[PDB]
Amino acid sequence: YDIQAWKKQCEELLNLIFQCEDSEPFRQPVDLLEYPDYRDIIDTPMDFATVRETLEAGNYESPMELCKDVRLIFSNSKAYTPSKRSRIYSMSLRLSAFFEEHISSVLSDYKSALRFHKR
């Protein structure tokens, strides 16, 4: 029932994601010199360094907000991909599966802790 535990749990999960080779295309904002049309398709860029910085700044109130930004990294890759077989998109799907597998208990524990706080 620790309402604050999610933050360190998210820091640890981001550390695992950064050490994963599949995260390399997503560690920093998409390079607009490499992909000149990126902002014509994607309205809201997102990357894991921005998520980590937002967390460290104390600018996430809940793990749901962090999860919405991580999911935006993956939906941006899906929207930008020219093919469902592209290398970077394929990396995003594996990384998404890994993230969802680990974030589920973080979300459950936080929501349970908040319900206990308001019992």
Ligand X SMILES: CN(CCO)c1ccccn1
Q: Which residue, 35 or 116, has its beta carbon nearer to ligand X?
A: 35
- CA distances 24 to 1, 6, 57, 104, Å, are 35, 24, 23, 23
Residues contacting 106, CB < 8 A, separation 6+: 6, 9, 10, 13, 63
Report the phi/psi class of residue 4: left, alpha or beta, with left for phi > 0 and alpha for psi in -120 to 50.
alpha
5, 18, 25, 50: which one contacts ligand X (CB under 6 A)? 25
Is residue 54 involved in binding ligand X (CB under 6 A)? no
Does 81 interact with ligand X (rule: CB under 6 A)?
Answer: yes
Residue range at the interface with ligand X (CB under 6 A); choices 7-15, 49-57, 84-92, 105-113: 84-92
Span from 6-14, 16-24, 76-84, 102-110 in contact with ligand X (CB under 6 A): 76-84
Nearer CB in complex with ligand X: 98/111: 98
Residue with Cβ nearer ligand X (54 or 90): 90
